[PDB]
């Protein structure tokens, strides 16, 4: 039985948060400053260059998420294939919380919604990302809560496309503990858990619209895509 006996299932909530924080990827700068204004091709070029670089670090992070390397390489591939854009997106909205009306793609690449017009159908996605960022800001989402949610996205997003269920239960326990220690009543805890988990359905939704966008940009041949990025896209069709 894969996972049976895992360290992941033995962790305390404090040890699971410690493992998750230790696993965090670096915050990447754009290798290029963009000239003003943007074209469709220079915009998609920056964003696909960035996402490519974030993917490499995402793979390192995934390996250091408790429960993950207890799966077959087959299942690890399928979860990363299913989750990668939702994980890019939860990171983007987390980093963008302290920048109202803007998406901090990188410390040196802050875009507002108008700059999203430079790409056909990008403004709708930015609007949805801004709202998610804005909801997290409303909710005062904490660092520790964020890494828990990013782990759930990883483990959950391809889980129906049992050890995975046991690790998710472990992450649910950890979220509730973080909420209890911050002095939320049981009522406020259950309500907060549900509010954050409901946002994940919206991240899934933005991911699915994102992927249609990314496939439409593959066909237009507007910008080169890395082999890794072409594989990720093929996995969704």
């Amino acid at each position: 039985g894969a996972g049976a006996g895992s360290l992941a299932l033995s962790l305390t909530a404090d040890q699971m948060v410690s493992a998750l924080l230790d696993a965090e990827p670096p915050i990447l700068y754009s290798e290029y400053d963009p000239t003003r204004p943007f074209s469709e091709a220079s915009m998609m070029g920056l964003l696909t260059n960035l996402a490519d670089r974030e993917l490499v670090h995402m793979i390192n992070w995934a390996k250091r998420v408790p429960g993950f390397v207890d799966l077959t390489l087959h299942d690890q591939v399928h979860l990363l294939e299913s989750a990668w854009l939702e994980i890019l997106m939860i990171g983007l909205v987390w980093r963008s919380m302290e920048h109202p009306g803007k998406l901090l793609f990188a410390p040196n690449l802050l875009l507002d919604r108008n700059q999203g017009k430079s790409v056909e159908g990008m403004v709708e996605i930015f609007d949805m990302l801004l709202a998610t960022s804005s909801r997290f800001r409303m909710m005062n989402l904490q660092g520790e809560e964020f890494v828990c949610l990013k782990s759930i996205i990883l483990l959950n997003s391809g889980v129906y496309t049992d050890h995975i269920h046991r690790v998710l239960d472990k992450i649910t326990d950890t979220l509730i503990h973080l909420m209890a220690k911050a002095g939320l009543t049981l009522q406020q805890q259950h309500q907060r858990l549900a509010q954050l988990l409901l946002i994940l359905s919206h991240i899934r939704h933005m991911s699915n619209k994102g992927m249609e966008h990314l496939y439409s940009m593959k066909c237009k041949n507007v910008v080169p895509l890395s082999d890794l990025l072409l594989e990720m896209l093929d996995a969704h069709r």
Binding site: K63, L73, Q76, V77, L80, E81, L228, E231, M232
Partner: peptide, 8 residues
Amino acid sequence: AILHRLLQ
């Protein structure tokens, strides 16, 4: 498949 090689 790059992801298999990068994940092993």
